[PDB]
Design a protein around this ligand. Structure first.
Ligand SMILES: CC(C)C[C@H](N)C(=O)O
Ligand code: NA
Ligand code: NA
Length: 489
């Protein structure tokens, strides 16, 4: 079996798994909508009670399965629970990363296309907030193919489509070279580049002074607390969902990556380091860039408006408009979209590896054929997201939101209840440079599952292109269940 070459490459590849588009696009809008500075209270609680424990559990399950030649949850769940229904539940560990990859790689291709257009200065150039934002709203809509009327259909530009092809080619170019010579070698270059880009952008944003406000006014707006809405269960659901997404928990990606860690290698300190690096990039770097620069340029009055506009409006419309209004801002735009691209790329290769690992481990396919077939399924399926509006939202909800929380509870129960709390605890701490604090044993066994279960219950008591997407992703689950059937025989 393939293995990571170095401990540094392992940590940077896992950090690249976590540090993605959610750090810079999702997190700022999540915090602004769910209490501002007060959002850190449920965010930190979810990080300590759910994020950290589930991270170590997924590292352990992956390495445990990897020692027996299995990198994906259908086989690994069966190894932990000799029951056919454990294999069916394990299919979610392939379905979730595949469905998420379908729309994640498309958004990733947007950042590459915007990086290209901004590097060469093929950007619009406009006084008034709406007068400055309109040319960039139309720039994104022409790139995406937004309808002029009520039609719910998208028609991407030829440039966007070709850039999506290039994006798939780049993901294949990394993934086809394997774990050490592909993912690990690219992580050692991309992650240092990522942090340098982000730190530089934070510094440049903290120097913004406009007639409407300063960077300090933007930081004040973002971290303005609103502790009253901590009574809203939706804030706690948003915080837990953000923790799942930003740490790549419940996507089967950590498990597959950890399956290439040697049996006796540390996973306690490595996983803690990767999770810590992500939180630094998320709350320190991701939070400091987009929203503060937006408030600094459009003032606090317009800040509430663009905060409610959404992550895509903020990342692909509002921030580009700001850039075009500063000296050398087209290059700042390039660095922004270059940052997002490497952040997305290091995450998309992680979210496509589970399907590659399943084809290699269980169907005995070569790496070349496993990578090319995985890319083909993702490329084809992405035409749903490319041409159908609201298709991405449905996939992100079922797979990247509800699915990951249900799967996080499932892998927890299988590993720590059915397999054995004492056995799982021994499996986590084995080989660890540091040991897990004893209090987390009771957190994993009682607190985390009770927290997730109550959230599930509280979550349940709170067009027709949607049925097209539902139909398709249901078929994907049927397809993957058939491949698991074929792997048995
Ligand atoms: C699906 C995951 C790869 C998402 C990634 N952890 C992010 O924060 O963007
Ligand atoms: Na993240
Ligand atoms: Na990433």
């Amino acid at each position: 079996r393939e293995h990571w070459a170095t401990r540094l490459g392992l940590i940077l590849a896992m950090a690249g798994n976590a540090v993605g588009l959610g750090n810079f696009l999702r997190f700022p809008v999540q915090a602004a909508e769910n209490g501002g500075g007060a959002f850190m209270i449920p965010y930190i609680i979810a990080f300590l009670l759910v994020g950290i424990p589930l991270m170590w559990i997924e590292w352990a399950m992956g390495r445990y399965g990897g020692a027996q030649g299995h990198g994906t949850t259908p086989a690994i769940f069966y190894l932990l629970w000799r029951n056919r229904f454990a294999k069916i539940l394990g299919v979610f560990g392939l379905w979730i990363p595949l469905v998420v990859a379908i729309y994640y790689v498309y958004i990733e291709s947007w950042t590459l296309g915007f990086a290209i257009k901004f590097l060469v200065g093929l950007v619009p150039e406009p006084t008034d907030p709406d007068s400055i934002l309109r040319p960039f709203k139309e720039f994104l809509y022409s790139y995406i193919g937004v309808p002029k009327g009520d039609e719910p259909i998208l028609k991407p530009s030829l440039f966007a489509y070709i850039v999506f092809l290039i994006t798939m080619f780049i993901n294949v170019s990394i993934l086809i070279r394997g774990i050490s010579k592909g993912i690990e070698r690219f992580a050692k270059i991309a992650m240092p580049t990522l942090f340098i880009l982000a730190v530089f952008l934070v510094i440049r944003v903290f120097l913004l002074e406009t007639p409407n406000g300063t960077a300090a006014d933007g930081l004040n707006f973002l971290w303005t607390p609103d502790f009253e809405k901590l009574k809203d269960p939706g804030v706690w659901i948003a915080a837990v969902g953000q923790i799942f997404f930003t740490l790549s928990l419940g996507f089967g990606a950590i498990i597959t990556y950890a399956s290439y860690v040697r049996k006796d290698q540390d996973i306690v300190l490595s996983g803690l380091t990767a999770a810590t690096l992500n939180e630094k990039a998320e709350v320190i770097l991701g939070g400091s860039i987009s929203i503060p620069a937006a408030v600094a340029f459009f003032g606090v009055a317009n800040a509430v408006a663009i905060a409610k506009a959404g992550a895509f409006n903020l990342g692909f419309i509002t921030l580009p408009a700001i850039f075009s209004q500063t000296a050398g801002g087209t290059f700042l735009g390039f660095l922004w979209f270059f940052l997002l691209f490497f952040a997305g790329l290091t995450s998309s290769i992680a979210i496509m590896q589970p399907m590659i690992a399943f084809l290699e481990d269980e169907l005995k396919l070569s790496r070349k054929h496993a990578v090319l077939w995985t890319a083909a399924i993702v490329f084809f399926s992405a035409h749903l997201v490319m041409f159908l509006n609201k298709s991405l939202d449905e996939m992100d909800f079922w797979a990247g939101t509800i699915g990951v929380v249900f799967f996080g509870l499932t892998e927890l129960i299988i590993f720590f209840w059915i397999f054995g709390a004492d056995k799982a605890w021994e499996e986590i701490n084995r080989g660890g440079i540091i040991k897990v604090p004893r209090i987390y044993y009771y957190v994993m066994r009682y607190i985390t599952p009770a927290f997730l279960a109550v959230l599930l219950v509280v979550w349940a008591r709170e067009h027709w292109t949607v049925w097209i997407t539902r139909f398709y992703i249901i078929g994907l689950f049927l397809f993957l269940t058939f491949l698991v059937f074929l792997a048995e025989r």
